[PDB]
Every structure is written in structure tokens, then in C-alpha cells.
Write a protein that binds this DNA or RNA. Structure first.
Ligand SMILES: [Cl-]
Ligand SMILES: [Cl-]
Ligand SMILES: [Mg+2]
Ligand SMILES: [Mg+2]
Ligand SMILES: [Mg+2]
Ligand SMILES: [Mg+2]
Ligand SMILES: [Mg+2]
Ligand SMILES: [Mg+2]
Ligand SMILES: [Mg+2]
Ligand code: NA
Ligand code: NA
Ligand code: NA
Ligand code: NA
Ligand code: NA
Ligand SMILES: [Sr+2]
Ligand SMILES: [Sr+2]
Ligand SMILES: [Sr+2]
Ligand SMILES: [Sr+2]
Ligand SMILES: [Sr+2]
Ligand SMILES: [Sr+2]
Ligand SMILES: [Sr+2]
Lengths: 95, 154, 186, 140, 160
RNA sequence: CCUGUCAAACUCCAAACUUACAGACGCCGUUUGACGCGGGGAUUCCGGUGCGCGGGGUA
RNA sequence: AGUGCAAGAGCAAAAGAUAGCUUGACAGUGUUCUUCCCAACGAGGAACGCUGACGCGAAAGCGUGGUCUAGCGAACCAAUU
RNA sequence: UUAGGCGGCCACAGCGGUGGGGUUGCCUCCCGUACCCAUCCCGAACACGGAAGAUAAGCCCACCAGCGUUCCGGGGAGUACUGGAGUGCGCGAGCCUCUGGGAAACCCGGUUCGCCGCCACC
């Protein structure tokens, strides 16, 4: 890459499909998850805050608690265990 | 139930393809194994499609090979009808051959090594650089084609 | 509408019925919502909770079913609104609900208005609802005093269908008196 | 059917597009109510680079205030077909605009469940000329 | 410059003018010849020159082939003959040349070419049953001025 | 309306395929102790070739 | 369109505009990620918390600067609280 | 749901169009400014108070496909492209065969003029 900031090469993954453009529905921004639940991580282009590092888009982690209204999700980056702080708006239950 | 025989060596073959063979219990050239026709196994053989020869053998052929190449999970004990009867849930080889072909049991379940260590093909094979439809020996065979191979390697 | 790339607002947005930005902030409380609404003739209070396939109303009251307890007056005024909130509130307490956040939809936060009267009502019923006293109309107005004095400037009865001539805020009292009473069939 | 279809006057907006005001006083007399300042947008070569600043004034009249104005304002104009909108509005002259519409226009001016007025309920130039002409004056 | 330098499709598509400046002008004079006021449908015969290999044709080559082709159609049918020929391709691919060793080698802009897939029609003519051989001859001359071998395929024409 | 063409820094579409998690089968581990963890010792940080996909360059 | 400035991205009862008010561009201390994919490494950065004190709002709530990704600096020493 | 409120999905729901519906019921338009409140000017809106009138708007109900969208059949197409393999072809750029996957445009015929949840209600 020519540069190395967090949003490097994220044109696609952080752009909205034209029809999904505009403020997102509140339901998924208020969704509650339980410890142990499996959640897919996917940033919502329309939601500015509560995001994780784009590099983690597509991970399916495990909720292990929360910090304020955000959730602490456990994932394994390659072989390294990491904890990700992420709000409901960027999460989806698995299955 | 299809019979798998490795006909192409490990040198230069993709590692994920080599691990697939090993998971299918084959670790040498000319070694044959019997695999149930499930979706899971289907993907596996499809992946090793270019380094093997497979197909469904006839009851008789399976019986010939078992008689001549089947082995105990351990030991050099010869495997014949008496061995089969005194060690398996069948009366003789045929009962085993039938249960295998009908996918009711596996060589392991009956205290037999999952692998049949065949002999080089008498009179050679059709070549390992081309598939069956092109005159080679690789890929899926006719029950008659597979029987020809398995018998020449009895 | 125009083409593949055209962006159509969410249904409740086209219908101009739901302010999604306010809704979100509302839902962040984690508490139930005291949905205060009003029509030209009626007032409706609902205690809504969040659900998998849509909201869930746990309790509610309509100004219409106010008569069911002794109300012969119009149902689109301050006294009506307060009592409706209180009734809805009381029913709320019955269903196990104990706290709420005022959701006034697309109505304006005007001091002393009806949605605020609905709120004062629901609060008196025993419901814990974040509020601010100096934005609520003074007691008398809630009772309906402002209307009596309006009928004072008579010459022609305020109400067509005779409920009375000089109107009665004292009736409001009789009704509230009845509602705060245990007996009452909620 | 006709009672809820027969036109009316929503608003009469008198205004003087000056360009730098002192004229508020006359409007406050010819109409009857307070006028409002008029701000401009975009910079303009004609010594008009100041974005927000007085440049005009207008007065929107409704109900009686509107009619009591037109009674003495309309006679001061020679209305014509062209001088009309595609919506049924007309403005003559100091500008004088008349906004005509059918009964329930509120449906598009209210906050809750507002909605656009169907083309059928939209007033027409012909339907407008009629109503007006049908009250103290002629057309073209 | 030899065409061997640019005839192959061995480089990314380079056509974005918003990121490329100094692009030389095309040498192709016209893309529609003959009587262009008339429709191609008004002719009983339609013959195309088809490329047999995928390649790149520099605008200099298009101009030469188109020229030596139409020029023949003019000499044999007149400056107003009843026919019409079309060069359906345009040179969108910008070409470079590194003209200082291999250091900072990105080349300067030197021309344009049209990418033609094998089997495609480069030229297409429409004529009357009479001048069918005159157009077949114009094409023979044209394919002698472009890299690939070509097929002179006759579309509407059952007058054999 | 018709008719002629395009895009590494275009996209109304859209693969093969790569990839997170889980279950199943396979293989493996519980005297051959896997997975994980702590500690000692390194060597290494001129690479090359084929194939696939490339970017530069006439090559 | 606008949103200070590259580019790509976000935003419409707003993240834009206008008006009014206000100083959260606040103090203390963390979690996590990033910097440095995997995989150890500082300064710097971000998201998300707790505590304290405040602003605005009816209230939910918003405000840990400017919608997001650039605008940055070790030890020793000096000045400062 | 003989007209209501709060929603979930967020065009299969859009755009446009046709027909039907309301005496003390519902929603509205509607009537009206003493109060709470309101317009940098306007009871337009916001807010409050109310029933003389009305179903013309809106809204709800029934429906139409011309545009947009969703899905489906048939054709394009097992084409384009492609993971694995080859002492197959080609001067070469490149192509072919076997194995496993597999489009897009577009045409023709259908589908689509919302679906669903909670509450309230002759
Ligand atoms: Cl993160
Ligand atoms: Cl309402
Ligand atoms: Mg990309
Ligand atoms: Mg042994
Ligand atoms: Mg051979
Ligand atoms: Mg120093
Ligand atoms: Mg200092
Ligand atoms: Mg009607
Ligand atoms: Mg060769
Ligand atoms: Na969105
Ligand atoms: Na001013
Ligand atoms: Na140099
Ligand atoms: Na740091
Ligand atoms: Na109606
Ligand atoms: Sr190249
Ligand atoms: Sr040639
Ligand atoms: Sr990749
Ligand atoms: Sr921010
Ligand atoms: Sr009015
Ligand atoms: Sr050559
Ligand atoms: Sr298939």
C-alpha cells in the first residue's frame, strides 16, 4: 500500500450499496447479545461510531461481556487472540 | 462405494491434495482404499481426482483383492474365509465384500487395515499423464475398467 | 422509483409517521416507551416495549374508554389527556411495568401541552418517568379550568351537545378520584 | 363535492424587492400587519457581496387581512391569462402574489403524516381565473 | 516504431483520460464511409473483415488499412458509389515508450490502439450484388496493413 | 429515435475462488500426552527455478 | 448541494442551513485495538468504559474538538502548574 | 384493523392510474383563537378549544403493470470466466482436452400495485 492508515484499501468494504444508503434502522443498533453468543462482525457504512478495525470485517467472534453499551467480542486474528470493542450496529447473530 | 488407488507419487503434488490422500488412509503409490459414497468423501476424491484411479468394483473383483491383499489391523496373519469368519461379523470374504460395497461396515470396523497394498499392474497401466476418456488411467472408471486395474494389481 | 440506484425512504418515513433519529435515542434508554399520541377528537397513551418482529404494547388507554368510568365530556382536551395517561399508567403498573421514557412522536414539546399532561398522568399512576415539572401545565389547567373561564365569556354555550352550560372541572376530579381508587375495573 | 372543491385564498404576499428597508413603513400601512426583512444568498458583482443582510421586505396575509387587501389591490391591476401559474396562482405588480388552493391544503402543510396534494386536487389556471374573475373584475 | 512493440495484449487496460495527459491525436480520418445518409439495411450484401487473432491495432494502422480499402471502393465505385463501409473500432488503449537506463522507466505517452478480439468484425461494408467483388478486393488490401490474418466473411449474400 | 465503440485509479450486475465460525465425516491425541504454556540453545534476515496471477520494460 | 484542505468513504424531519444558547477543545483513571495483519517493539492515534465537574434539551440523549482515515517527536536539561 | 396507534423487514413496499367508503362510531379535511403555546410577519404551521359542514384531499378498501423493483420459466448458455490435472496443439501472443464450479447483458412469457408482528376497536 502507498500509505498505512486504518482505512487503507477499504473503498469497497466501507461503501454502501446505493440502496442501503442513508441512516440505518435502529433495531440492530439496540439489539442485545448474551455472553457466549456467536456474532458476525461487519461494519455498517452508515454508522460512524462503535466500529472496529476494518481489517477484522468478516470475523465471527464470541461475546464475552460489554463495556458501556458496546460489546467485547473475542476473535482469533490468524493465531493471535484479540478482544474487540464493538457496538451492536456492526454485529449480527450467527445462524 | 468406490475403490481408490494412488497412481501418482507425492513429489510435486499440492500439499492439501497430499494430506487429503493421507486422510483417506493412502500413503504410498499403488495403495488402495475403499470409500463410501457420501458428499463429504465425494469432495475428497474429486480433489485427488488427478493423482488417483477410482470407481465401483464388482463383488467378485473386491473379493479377489481382499483375499490377496487384505491385512489385519496388526500382524502378518493371512486373511481368508476362516480369518474373516473367526474375526468379523461375516461368514466369509463374500459377506464382507457385500457389506463393504453396500456401505454397511468398513475394514477398520472389522479389525482390518483400511488399506490394501496392491502390486504394480501386470502388463502396465494406461499412463498417468491422461484421464480415462483420453486413454489414460487417472480419474473415475467403469466398473469394468476398475476391475481390470484392480485385477492386474491383485 | 426513477431507477436501480434510487433510494426510497423506509416505509414509516415516507408515511411521515416515525422520526427514526428520535426513536433511536429513545430506545437507548433500555426502558419502555410511553407513546403519547393525539387525534382531533381523542388522545391515546401506550406503554410500548421492543420486540423481535415489531414493538409490543404492554398496556394502553384511549380517551374513548374514559366514559367507561363516568365521563360525558369531550375527549380531546387537557383533562381528557391527563386522565387518559393516568388510566394507561395504572394499567401499566398492573402488567408489571414500573418505568418509562416519554415518546411524543412528531408532536411538539410545547410547555403545558397534552402529551405532557399524559405524562403527568402516567407519572401519578406510579410510573417512574424522566420529566421536568416546569414544562407541565399548572394543575388548574389540567383540571380544565381554562375551559370553564372560556365558557364564562358565554352568550352562547361552549359545548353544543349539552354536557352542561358552565362546564365542570369538578367532573375531572370525580373521574381522577375514581381512577386513583383501588376497586376500579382496569 | 363542490363545497370541498371550491377554491379560496391561502395567502397574499406583498413584497418589495429592493436591494439594500426604509420601505417597510408603507407596506405596514397598505396591508395592516408587520413586514419581514429579506436576506440574500450568493455574492453578487453589483456591490452585493454581503451574504446575510436586508435587501427587501414582505408581508404574508391570510383570511380577512388577505381579502381586505385584494379588494383594493386587484382593481390596481390588469390581470391576464399568461400572468397565471400552472398551479392556479397569479402575481401582479412592489409585487403582489396570491396563493389560491382547495380546502384541505393542510395535508401538505402539517407535520404529522403530511402528504403531497394529488394533481386532481391541485387548482388549475382555468379553475383559478374563474374563481377570481367570479369576484370583482375581469380576466385576460 | 515496429508494431511488434505493441501488437500484443500484454499490459493492463490504459484508457483513463482523467489520469493521462499528452495523448496524441488519432490518425483515423473517418469511421463511416460511402453514403452515410443511407441505412445499411438498404443493401442486399453485407461483408465484414474478421480478425483471426486477438491483437492491438495502432491508430496509424487503422488509418492505413481503412484508407487503402475505401480508396479502392472510390476508384471502383466512384466518389459517390452506392455503398457504405464502417470501421467499428476506436483506439482507446493509450501506448507508451520508455524513451536513463531502467531507472524510472514508466514510458512517456506516444499513441493509441484498438484492442480487437479474434473473430470480431473490424470493418463491415454494405453493397449491391454488383460491387460484391470490389469490396472483397478492398478488404484484401486492408488486411495486408494490419498485424493478424483475417477472414473476409460475407453476411447477407445468397447470390453464389 | 436510430446507429459505432470503451475504462488500473467506472459499476445496475457478477463468478470460479479465498476467507471467519460452527456441526458432520475423515485423520490425529489421551503409556508415542496431542492443543496450549514456561524456559535453554540456535541457525537465519545475498536466494534461485517451474507453474498460476501479476506491475514496469521493445525485450 | 453542503459539510475548512488530497483522495476514497459517511450524512437529508441530518452529520447540511439558519437562529439562539454554550464552552465537553473539561479533570482523574482505565479497557481494547492500532502503530507493528499473522507475530515481539516506543511515541503517536482511535474506539469504548468508570469517576468528578459541567453545557444544552421536556426527556430519552448528545458533547472525551472539527463526519471518517494525514496535521507528528525519546533520554538528559530548562521553564512552568 | 366500516377508516386507529406503535412497529419489524426497508421499493415484492417506488412512480403513475381507475373504482368504492363514512348522521350522534374511527381517522381526517373542517369550525374557531379566551386560555398553555406559537409565527425574525402571518392561529399557514406549531399549540390550544371545538363539532355547522364534508367524503372533494388525505386515509382505508378493491384493482390496473405503462415506468422502476423482486422472484420465476424458457432462450441466451453450460456460453463468458474459472479451482485441479496434462510429454495435448501453436513460431508465438495464445489455445485445447479431462475433472469440479459457473455468470452478465438481452429477448419472450409469468410474478410483484407489499409481507409480517404487538395493541386497541361493531
Ligand atoms: Cl478493533
Ligand atoms: Cl400524534
Ligand atoms: Mg477494489
Ligand atoms: Mg501390519
Ligand atoms: Mg505412456
Ligand atoms: Mg541532546
Ligand atoms: Mg516552558
Ligand atoms: Mg372519491
Ligand atoms: Mg510446442
Ligand atoms: Na444504511
Ligand atoms: Na435582517
Ligand atoms: Na540517473
Ligand atoms: Na500508544
Ligand atoms: Na376522502
Ligand atoms: Sr507485460
Ligand atoms: Sr496481416
Ligand atoms: Sr486473494
Ligand atoms: Sr467524531
Ligand atoms: Sr384555519
Ligand atoms: Sr515469431
Ligand atoms: Sr452445476
Amino acid at each position: 500500500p502507498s500509505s498505512n492508515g486504518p482505512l487503507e484499501g477499504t473503498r469497497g468494504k466501507l461503501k454502501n450499496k446505493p440502496r442501503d444508503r442513508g441512516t440505518s434502522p435502529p433495531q440492530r443498533a439496540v439489539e442485545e447479545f448474551d455472553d457466549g453468543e456467536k456474532v458476525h462482525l461487519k461494519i455498517d457504512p452508515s454508522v460512524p461510531n462503535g466500529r472496529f478495525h476494518p481489517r477484522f470485517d468478516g470475523q465471527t467472534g464470541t461475546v464475552e461481556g460489554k463495556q458501556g453499551d458496546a460489546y467485547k467480542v473475542d476473535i482469533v486474528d490468524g493465531g493471535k487472540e484479540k478482544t474487540i470493542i464493538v457496538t451492536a450496529a456492526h454485529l449480527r447473530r450467527q445462524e | 462405494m468406490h475403490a481408490l488407488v494412488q497412481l501418482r507419487g507425492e513429489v510435486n503434488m499440492h500439499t492439501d491434495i497430499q494430506d487429503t490422500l493421507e486422510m483417506l488412509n493412502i500413503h504410498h503409490v499403488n495403495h488402495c482404499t475403499l470409500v463410501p459414497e457420501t458428499d463429504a468423501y465425494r469432495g475428497m476424491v474429486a480433489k485427488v481426482n488427478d493423482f488417483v484411479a477410482f470407481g465401483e468394483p464388482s463383488q467378485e473383483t473386491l473379493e479377489t483383492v481382499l483375499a490377496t491383499r487384505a491385512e489385519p489391523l496388526e500382524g502378518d496373519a493371512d486373511v481368508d474365509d476362516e480369518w474373516v469368519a473367526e474375526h468379523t461379523d461375516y461368514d466369509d470374504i463374500s459377506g464382507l465384500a457385500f457389506a463393504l460395497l453396500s456401505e454397511e461396515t468398513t475394514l477398520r470396523e472389522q479389525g482390518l487395515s483400511p488399506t490394501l497394498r496392491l502390486h504394480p499392474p501386470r502388463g502396465g497401466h494406461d499412463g498417468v499423464k491422461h484421464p480415462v476418456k483420453e486413454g489414460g488411467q487417472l480419474g473415475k472408471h467403469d466398473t469394468e475398467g476398475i476391475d481390470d486395474l484392480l485385477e492386474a494389481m491383485r | 422509483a426513477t431507477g436501480p440506484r434510487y433510494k426510497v425512504p423506509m416505509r414509516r418515513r415516507r408515511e411521515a409517521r416515525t422520526d427514526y433519529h428520535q426513536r433511536l435515542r429513545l430506545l437507548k434508554s433500555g426502558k419502555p416507551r410511553l407513546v403519547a399520541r393525539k387525534s382531533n377528537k381523542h388522545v391515546r397513551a401506550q406503554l410500548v416495549t421492543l420486540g423481535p418482529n415489531g414493538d409490543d404494547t404492554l398496556a394502553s388507554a384511549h380517551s374513548s374508554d374514559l366514559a367507561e368510568y363516568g365521563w360525558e365530556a369531550p375527549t380531546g382536551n387537557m383533562p381528557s389527556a391527563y386522565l387518559t395517561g393516568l388510566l394507561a399508567g395504572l394499567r401499566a403498573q398492573e402488567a408489571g411495568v414500573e418505568e418509562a421514557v416519554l415518546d411524543i412522536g412528531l408532536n411538539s414539546p410545547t410547555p403545558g401541552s397534552k402529551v405532557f399532561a399524559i405524562q403527568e398522568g402516567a407519572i401519578d399512576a406510579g410510573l417512574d418517568i424522566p420529566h421536568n415539572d416546569d414544562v407541565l401545565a399548572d394543575w388548574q389547567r389540567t383540571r380544565g379550568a381554562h375551559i370553564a373561564e372560556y365558557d364564562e365569556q358565554l352568550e352562547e354555550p361552549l359545548y353544543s351537545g349539552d354536557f352542561d352550560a358552565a362546564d365542570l372541572p369538578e367532573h375531572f376530579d370525580e373521574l381522577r378520584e375514581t381512577l386513583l381508587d383501588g376497586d376500579i375495573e382496569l | 363535492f363542490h363545497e370541498m372543491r371550491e377554491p379560496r385564498i391561502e395567502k397574499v404576499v406583498v413584497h418589495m424587492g429592493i436591494g439594500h428597508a426604509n420601505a417597510e413603513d408603507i407596506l405596514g400601512e397598505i396591508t395592516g400587519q408587520m413586514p419581514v426583512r429579506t436576506k440574500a444568498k450568493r455574492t453578487v458583482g453589483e456591490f452585493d457581496i454581503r451574504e446575510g443582510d436586508p435587501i427587501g421586505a414582505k408581508v404574508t396575509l391570510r383570511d380577512e387581512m388577505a381579502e381586505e387587501f385584494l379588494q383594493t389591490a386587484l382593481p390596481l391591476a390588469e390581470l391576464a391569462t399568461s400572468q397565471f401559474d400552472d398551479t392556479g396562482n397569479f402575481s401582479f405588480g412592489l409585487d403582489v402574489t396570491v396563493n389560491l388552493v382547495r380546502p384541505g391544503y393542510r395535508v401538505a402543510k402539517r407535520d404529522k403524516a403530511s402528504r403531497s396534494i394529488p394533481t386532481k386536487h391541485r387548482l388549475n389556471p382555468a379553475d383559478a381565473v374563474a374563481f377570481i374573475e367570479s369576484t370583482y373584475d375581469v380576466e385576460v | 516504431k515496429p508494431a511488434s512493440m505493441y501488437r500484443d495484449i500484454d499490459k493492463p487496460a490504459y484508457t483513463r483520460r482523467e489520469y493521462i495527459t499528452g495523448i496524441p491525436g488519432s490518425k483515423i480520418a473517418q469511421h463511416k464511409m460511402g453514403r452515410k445518409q443511407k441505412d445499411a439495411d438498404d443493401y442486399p450484401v453485407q461483408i465484414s473483415l474478421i480478425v483471426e487473432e486477438t491483437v492491438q491495432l495502432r491508430h496509424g494502422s487503422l488509418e492505413a488499412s481503412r484508407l487503402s480499402a475505401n480508396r479502392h471502393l472510390i476508384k471502383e465505385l466512384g466518389e459517390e458509389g452506392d455503398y457504405k463501409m464502417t470501421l467499428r473500432k476506436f483506439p482507446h488503449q493509450v501506448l507508451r515508450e520508455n524513451k536513463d537506463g531502467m531507472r524510472a522507466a514508466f514510458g512517456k505517452i506516444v499513441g493509441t490502439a484498438a484492442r480487437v478480439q479474434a473473430g470480431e468484425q473490424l470493418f463491415t461494408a454494405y453493397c449491391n450484388v454488383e460491387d460484391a467483388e470490389h469490396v472483397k478486393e478492398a478488404f484484401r488490401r486492408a488486411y495486408n496493413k494490419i498485424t493478424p490474418s483475417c477472414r473476409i466473411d460475407s453476411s447477407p449474400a445468397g447470390n453464389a
